[PDB]
Design a protein around this ligand. Structure first.
Ligand SMILES: *[C@@H]1O[C@H](CO)[C@@H](O[C@@H]2O[C@H](CO)[C@@H](O)[C@H](O)[C@H]2NC(C)=O)[C@H](O)[C@H]1NC(C)=O
Ligand SMILES: *[C@@H]1O[C@H](CO)[C@@H](O)[C@H](O)[C@H]1NC(C)=O
Ligand SMILES: *[C@@H]1O[C@H](CO)[C@@H](O)[C@H](O)[C@H]1NC(C)=O
Ligand SMILES: *[C@@H]1O[C@H](CO)[C@@H](O)[C@H](O)[C@H]1NC(C)=O
Ligand SMILES: *[C@@H]1O[C@H](CO)[C@@H](O)[C@H](O)[C@H]1NC(C)=O
Ligand SMILES: *[C@@H]1O[C@H](CO)[C@@H](O)[C@H](O)[C@H]1NC(C)=O
Lengths: 57, 96, 49, 87, 42, 22
């Protein structure tokens, strides 16, 4: 199964406070509108990182 | 008729200036150019220019006078070239 | 625990023992004349403490 | 000690400023802060959950206002841009 | 990611919600393990 | 309609805006 990662997966790259300052950084991020898999078990690679989510009851 | 046309034109000026605020580009762009020159000048403070640390105090509090002198020399060269570039830009823009 | 160790390892099989939760008095390691050289590159020997 | 130009130091982070207790709404992991120009603007004191502001101790050029020495040797100084309860 | 920092988040929702949510870090692991694979328990 | 501590002082103009308007 596949699905589109609309806008998720952005993290504060470092621990320095900022405010209303549009900051441009370069690190590892999950590119927008990407192809995220969708499981409902198998073991997976870890190429450069992971954005793992979950929706459980 | 002349006075009417005059006063109507003044009113049109009022309306235009208050609605389509893109009329003051000539002044707003002088202000923006100065702001961007200053922002570049301040950004340049936080670049290594080939040194090990873009913080003069972190260089001072880590190295001996001999090696710190090489690092500080790189930083001074870089910052001085940046400041001279900014001042030349200002001289040209002020001539304009 | 890393300098007075009973033994080292193979140079191609070296071991790295990171350290934390310290007050690292580098003065004793500096004035300790046991070491053959003090070749620092990111710091100056009189600046660790 | 606050409200003075103080030669602060935290973990080696040094400098000088008017260390003033602040309200930088950190996330507990965050260490310090900045503004539009990427300037050190706080620090988490290694011995307290204190986040303080920073404003460098006021400098500013001096300017000497003088009638010509031809007229008199009296002058008047102009400390530029200082709330000069602080000279 | 890599070192092995583990950011996180948690929201209520109601098949991936189209929205935005930053990721405020939780844990740091200063180990250095070579990881090229992973899996999830259940 | 018209819209930091590194030795970057900004001197004030000699003719204030109200004197200009006068
Ligand atoms: C000359 O031009 C003026 C302005 O266009 C005319 O004056 C207007 O005429 C119209 C229609 O006749 C009136 O509704 C307006 O009230 C007049 N005044 C203004 C300020 O628009 C004028 O009729 C023209 N011809 C002449 C003067 O012979
Ligand atoms: C990537 O997403 C598209 C949908 O835009 C999908 O058709 C495609 O199968 C996905 N990639 C893979 C490898 O399945
Ligand atoms: C010791 O450090 C901890 C960590 O911030 C702090 O909460 C505590 O008040 C400190 N105590 C003393 C006596 O320094
Ligand atoms: C001041 O200048 C005038 C010329 O205007 C000269 O005659 C006079 O001697 C000068 N005096 C002093 C004290 O400089
Ligand atoms: C200087 O600062 C003090 C303290 O806030 C204030 O009371 C005073 O009015 C200030 N003076 C000027 C000229 O800003
Ligand atoms: C790390 O893991 C990969 C996974 O196959 C392996 O090929 C590699 O030899 C390991 N060590 C290093 C130093 O990359």
């Amino acid at each position: 199964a596949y699905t589109n990662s609309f806008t998720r997966g952005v993290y504060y790259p470092d621990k320095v406070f900022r405010s209303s300052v549009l900051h441009s950084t370069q690190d590892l991020f999950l590119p927008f509108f990407s192809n995220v898999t969708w499981f409902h078990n198998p073991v997976l690679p870890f190429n450069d990182g992971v954005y793992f989510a979950s929706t459980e009851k | 008729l002349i006075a009417n046309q005059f006063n109507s034109a003044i009113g049109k000026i009022q309306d235009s200036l208050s609605s389509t605020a893109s009329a003051l580009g000539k002044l707003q762009d002088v202000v923006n150019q100065n702001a961007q020159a200053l922002n570049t000048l301040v950004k340049q403070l936080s670049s290594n220019f080939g040194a090990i640390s873009s913080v003069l105090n972190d260089i001072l509090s880590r190295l001996d006078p001999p090696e710190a002198e090489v690092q500080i020399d790189r930083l001074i060269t870089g910052r001085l070239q940046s400041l001279q570039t900014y001042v030349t830009q200002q001289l040209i823009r002020a001539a304009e | 625990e890393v300098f007075n160790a009973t033994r080292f390892a193979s140079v191609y099989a070296w071991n790295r023992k990171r350290i934390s939760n310290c007050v690292a008095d580098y003065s004793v390691l500096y004035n300790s004349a046991s070491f053959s050289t003090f070749k620092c590159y990111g710091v100056s020997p009189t600046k660790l403490n | 000690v606050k409200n003075k130009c103080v030669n602060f130091n935290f973990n080696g982070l040094t400098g000088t400023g008017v260390l003033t207790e602040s309200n930088k709404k950190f996330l507990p992991f965050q260490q310090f802060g900045r503004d539009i120009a990427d300037t050190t603007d706080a620090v988490r004191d290694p011995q307290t959950l204190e986040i303080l502001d920073i404003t460098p101790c006021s400098f500013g050029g001096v300017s000497v206002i003088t009638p010509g020495t031809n007229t008199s040797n009296e002058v008047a100084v102009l400390y530029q841009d200082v709330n000069c309860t602080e000279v | 990611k890599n070192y092995f920092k583990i950011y996180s988040k948690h929201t209520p929702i109601n098949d991936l919600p189209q929205g935005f949510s930053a990721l405020e870090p939780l844990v740091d692991l200063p180990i250095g393990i070579n990881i090229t694979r992973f899996q999830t328990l259940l | 309609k018209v819209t930091k501590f590194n030795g970057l002082t900004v001197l004030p103009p000699l003719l204030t805006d109200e004197m200009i308007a006068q």
